[PDB]
């Protein structure tokens, strides 16, 4: 009965993936030539690992892919990825089968080769079109840290960062709730690298990571409200005319005054060319007199996207020194992200991190449960589904209030067909509802599912 | 109208596959992301060049894989060929796409993965496979040095060598001719103390001549009985090498020959001890003195070196025929090296580039482009022609062999004519779509038999 899902490739894609996948209900098998990375796998979680090349037909067999419930395939090449869902489709019949795609060259052509049957991929995860898209969200939420998405679209969180002298520092919780009775409440604090557990005597300081709940329609309404809204940005810069920097530029070009910093003589040449509104500079990412010459003390955002990750940080901690408002970096790992921002850094986003949350929209822990792209150390929010009628679940027909949740969680907000609700304690459970939930401590996850189990599954 | 070939893949193969395909009525075009290579061969050759990703979208509209006559994958992986025939079908309705496939894991599915249409490779190549089987050929045809197929395997090739005693010393060739008269073969080349020469009639074959003989695939075993060479075949084999065409071989050979195997690799001889039933086999160097003498090295008839290193091949080859091995064969990765190594000491070397060339030789031949390919040391370049157009708009149709004004150097060795192999003499007189099989000395007068047989207008 628990659920079988083959992942190819135990990078740190697979491998995070895979950690966050593995349960009694969702059992894992990992594929690579790797055997040094298997087996340091193999010793942190509970799963099984095959040595061999993801495409080949002995190897999807060993790995299980005739009872397979998903195939993921996140393996090193594009045609490797694009290989093993076609074989394991043919000779296997494998179901639900997902690929990270790199290559642009392929992505341009999305509908005539892998939404006709040509290559029988079920979805495809872009990592460079997933950046750029959340690095313009961001954009478009002017004072936002942060947005959280669900596979529940509807429902989102966004941070703000507190400060000395806004309107939310030194305010309880529970007093926030009455100076404002908005469609929100705080879902989560980071702080001092830690998470919070959101109470009504918990107390946001300077510094204070604080994310609120919001239905995705009412984001701006929401940080108007919160007097967190700023005025638009105005005037950003870039750092690395690469697929992701590039394609940003041509996004922005017409509504902010973009300009963009490429170190290769030959690409700043073609971007100058081809990107008609945006100011393009051949030169080095963290060059002060450049910077200087080029106003950084004006800029509202300064993004930093190149292909390596110190260039990234140590360009936008200088941007930052030099009186850019706000600074965005290109990190290689989640891990990395959460060590990164928070300080002199606003923002700092994954391509493995966007991949992964991308890919946890697609598979669900005990048919119940998805993970959101809030994932930081241990904590993390979640949401679930609520299956049956009140005879048939420990949750639906209960007011939240009298649910006993796992220690460190909270429930932020419920989400019943298209309306999203603020959670209270008076509010009562309805039989599909997608609960939204925030963790201290991911570990109690499969307390979640316990508790939400309907019937029919015993 | 210029047929249009895309290569994918600047690798040894494609590069060579470049060379036999050129020629005025060949527009071709070659893909790959080292540009270096790309203008090495555009120096070399007249053709055209994409830089980039072979199974790109882009990159083969860029080729123009919306009007090409042939797709050949030969990229550095099985997953790129695969995917630029999915591509190319898909969007582009690109015809007859070749593709060159190494795992054995794909290949033990090819039904499933390929003939049902789901991976769209009209013909796959596979190096391993036709390595194996063409040194399984030439073990069947004990005396040969080489076998070719030319025509859809109609009609065959077979270099045998003239030794003292035996039945084609010291005779010419119109003589031979006659003294095999109901089976219908002649020589299409010789090769003389280092060089090619022309078959005459007047030619006297002497002792240690490779001469070759054409005929029909359907006759041409009885050429070899009728040339003694069948009177006594092989029966001590030992190969070398227990890797996919080593241990392919011996499953192949094992029950009709007396076979021994080494292995190096302790755990894979174990296995194949265990698999291969009736061949022994030892764990062991490939070029061990102490080893091949108790194995009775002096006695065998056939030693195959097939180990996944070429100076290993050649070392264990020369040792295994200075003890006294009958005939050596050596696997070597790169074709030029072949016909260096070979001819002396070594026997035969065989490439698996030279196997992938000459299968991707059938389909350009099935295709009527314009082609060249070298024989064994040089003997001869081998073109096989399509006489294009009616009387009017050619110049060899409804004329006589005898008649047509061949470049220097030149020999018909076939026509073949629908079903029809005829083993040509001045007698023959050319029909419109006639195949012709042809034999050159020297590979200058290669574009003369191109004009020879282009339709009007001459140019
Ligand atoms: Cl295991
Ligand atoms: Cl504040
Ligand atoms: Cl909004
Ligand atoms: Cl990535
Ligand atoms: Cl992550
Ligand atoms: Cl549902
Ligand atoms: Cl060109
Ligand atoms: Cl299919
Ligand atoms: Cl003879
Ligand atoms: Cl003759
Ligand atoms: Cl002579
Ligand atoms: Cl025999
Ligand atoms: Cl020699
Ligand atoms: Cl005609």
């Known amino acids: 009965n628990a659920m079988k899902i083959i992942i190819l490739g135990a990078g740190q894609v697979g491998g995070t993936l895979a950690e966050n996948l593995v349960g009694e209900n969702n059992d894992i098998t990992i594929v690579d030539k790797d055997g040094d990375r298997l087996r340091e796998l193999q010793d942190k979680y509970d799963l099984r690992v095959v040595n061999g090349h993801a495409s080949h037909p002995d190897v999807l067999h060993e790995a299980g892919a005739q ?5 993921v395939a996140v393996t090193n090449t594009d045609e490797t990825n694009m290989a093993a869902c076609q074989v394991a489709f043919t000779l296997f019949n494998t179901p639900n089968r997902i690929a990270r795609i790199r290559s642009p060259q392929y992505l341009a052509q999305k509908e005539a080769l892998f939404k006709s049957g040509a290559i ?3 979805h495809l995860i872009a990592p460079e079109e997933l950046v750029t898209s959340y690095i313009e969200r961001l954009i478009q939420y002017p004072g936002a840290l942060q947005v959280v998405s669900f596979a529940e679209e509807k429902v989102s969180l966004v941070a703000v960062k507190a400060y000395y002298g806004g309107p939310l520092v030194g305010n309880a919780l529970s007093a926030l709730r009455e100076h404002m009775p908005i469609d929100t409440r705080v879902a989560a604090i980071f702080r001092q690298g830690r998470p919070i557990r959101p109470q009504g005597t ?10 609120f709940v919001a239905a995705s329609n009412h984001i701006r309404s929401v940080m108007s409200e919160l007097q967190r809204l700023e005025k638009p940005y105005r005037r950003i810069m870039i750092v690395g005319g690469g697929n992701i920097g590039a394609s940003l530029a041509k996004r922005l070009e017409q509504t902010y005054s973009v300009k963009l910093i490429e170190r290769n003589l030959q690409r700043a040449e073609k971007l100058s060319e081809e990107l008609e509104n945006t100011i393009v500079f051949c030169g080095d990412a963290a060059d002060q007199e450049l910077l200087t010459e080029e106003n950084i003390d004006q800029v509202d955002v300064f993004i930093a996207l190149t292909n390596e990750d110190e260039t990234n940080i140590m360009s936008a901690m200088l941007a930052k020194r030099m009186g850019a408002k706000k600074v965005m970096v290109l990190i290689q790992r989640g891990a990395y992200v959460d060590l ?11 391509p ?9 929209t697609h598979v669900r822990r005990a048919d119940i449960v998805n993970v959101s792209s809030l994932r930081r150390g241990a904590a993390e929010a979640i949401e679930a589904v609520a299956h049956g009628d009140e005879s048939n679940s420990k949750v639906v027909g209960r007011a939240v209030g009298d649910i006993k949740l796992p220690p460190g969680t909270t429930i932020g907000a419920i989400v019943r067909g298209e309306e999203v609700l603020i959670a209270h304690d008076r509010t009562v459970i309805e039989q599909d509802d997608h609960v939204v939930m925030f963790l201290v401590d991911k570990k109690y996850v499969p307390d979640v599912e316990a508790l939400f189990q309907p019937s029919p599954f015993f």
Do not use: K, R
């Open 67 to 71: 009872d397979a419930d998903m195939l």
């Open 202 to 211: 918990t107390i946001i300081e300077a510094d204070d990571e604080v994310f």
């Open 352 to 360: 493995q991190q966007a991949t992964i949350s991308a890919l946890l």
């Open 340 to 350: 990164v921002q928070g300080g002199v850094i606003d923002v700092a986003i994954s």
């Open 120 to 122: 029988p991929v079920d």
